[PDB]
Design a protein around this ligand. Sequence first.
Ligand SMILES: COC(=O)/C=C(\C)CC/C=C(\C)CC[C@H]1OC1(C)C
Length: 227
Amino acid sequence: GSDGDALLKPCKLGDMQCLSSATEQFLEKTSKGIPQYDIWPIDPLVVTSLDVIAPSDAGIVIRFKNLNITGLKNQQISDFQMDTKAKTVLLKTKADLHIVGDIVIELTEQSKSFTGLYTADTNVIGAVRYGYNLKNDDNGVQHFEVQPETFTCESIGEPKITLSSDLSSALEKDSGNNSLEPDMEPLKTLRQAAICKIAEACYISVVHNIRASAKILPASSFFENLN
Ligand SMILES: COC(=O)/C=C(\C)CC/C=C(\C)CC[C@H]1OC1(C)C
């Protein structure tokens, strides 16, 4: 990652150009993850495993493994709302996410299981709501209180699903589509629950990074003035 000449800087409130630029840059640096700042990587982002249930029949269970998600550290903030009167910050991010890893299709109703490769590429637009407060740490420095954020999926643009020739063929042949339909289920979840779930997993990493960082730097570090 050829990005180490910057990580975080003071921005003005209401400036979607400064704030957004900060989240993009900071995320870009932490994208590699560094144990020196208690920051985990998120680009590329590998998932040792990712289970997801399908409401289609409450029996289809898709368990992904070693999922490679790239194209997030360079995301773009779609919207953001900062309220001091309520100390709340709701901002949504959108960017082309590329997932590449394993996928296990365990049918509880059909009493079967499958394993293959899963490759998806599409834009993921999700909204996150988290509170923000200002309190002096145990040293006397006004730190930044990062409340528990909340994931809120919005859209996924054009979900481009791409399963291995063995898996994709095993599904289309198991359902009778012969072309594995996108909205035929469990495929429906492979583009909805899959994308959404993945986004959440990554959101936890990015959030944690900022949390630990706020412990090393004050609030002013993020905004030129928050009081
Ligand atoms: C999802 O993106 C962010 O949280 C980052 C933004 C809006 C730009 C940089 C500013 C912060 C991380 C400060 C937000 C506030 O939650 C604290 C306490 C970190």
